[PDB]
Structures are given as structure tokens and as C-alpha cells.
């Protein structure tokens, strides 16, 4: 759509044993999302209990890692980025505004 | 957007002992999703572990319950009809198209 509002957020990762950064990643040029044919690197999946829970959201779009542009790139350069972080990894990613609603019930 | 794509999927889930049916419901002509105002009811989470695990899906439209009609009702009136239900809710829903990429990486 043609409305849509992000916010930023940076964070700094860092890596706990059977978890790495606790995040999987999907998207790239060469990767795109199945029907809009989005091209951004995405958060797909943050494990629970792993060191990325509260940091990272699914869906949250990856801008940059360690200052270099997520923006038009390969799937596997957002990987080699993430691979040849030590132990920590600075993340900067836009989030969709809001979500949600008033009122939910669980049965 | 205007070229949305859903996929109708009809379920029958029955309760189980601390899970009831395991989802959750939010939405509601009273309890409109924040950002769009879509009043739609939705499955809004799907415990882990029960009943509709592997039926229902988070983000599913509710269409229709036992054959009464969601669209444009109060969420309490939702709640009412899966309340009401006996062991067995009949559920018809919408879940949009797709979704996904070929590659995902978890690290």
C-alpha cells in the first residue's frame, strides 16, 4: 500500500550457547517474499527464551547490520554479515506502527 | 489494498481439558483493529500444544461459527457463540494467499 508507517529501532545482539543471536532471517533480492515480491531482509522467526526475545520482532524489516545496508542485497550477504559478527551484533530495523486491538479473548 | 487474495478453510475443533478450544478472538464491530479500523473477527494466537494446532492459523478471518455469521458483530457476541458450543465448534474462515519465501536461515 501507499500508507503504510514504520519505526526504527536499533539494538545490539549478542550470542547465547544452542541459540546463536536466536533469530531466523528470510527475504533478499534473490529471495523475494512469494506474492508482494518484497525484496527486504526480514526477521522471520525469534526463538523463545533465546537472547533476541523482547529485542527483535517477527516481521520486523532489517535495515542495517554493523553499519552496512541490508537494503537490495543477496540472501546470503545478510547472512555472511551476521556470521562474521563476534559477539554481538548491532541491528537497526523498522517495525510496523501499532498493531493490535482493544480487547481479546483466549477459549 | 484492492488485490488481496483469501482461501476458505472450514474446521471442526473440539475442547480439550486447560486448553478449551486453544485460540484466542479478537476484532469486533465495537473492537476494530487498531491501525486499519478492519472489524473483522480474527484468530489473534493459537496456543501451543492444543486443540487447533495445525487448523486454525494466527491472523485467520472468522467467517462463520456453527453457521451464524461474523462479519460485522460485537466481539462479545463471538465470544457467546463458541461459549454456547458444545464439544464441537464448526469454524469457516479466510486465510490470505501464500505467504513466505524459498529461503529462510536461522543463526
New interface residues.
Partial sequence: ?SHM?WEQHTVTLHRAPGF??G??????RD?????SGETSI?I??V?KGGPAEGQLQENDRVAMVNGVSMDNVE?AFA?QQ??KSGKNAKITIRRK???????????
Fill in positions: 500500500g508507517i546463536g543471536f533469530i531466523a532471517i528470510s527475504g533478499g529471495n523475494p517474499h512469494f506474492q526480514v522471520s522467526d526463538l540472501h547472512v551476521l556470521r506502527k501499532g498493531g493490535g486491538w482493544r480487547r481479546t479473548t483466549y477459549l
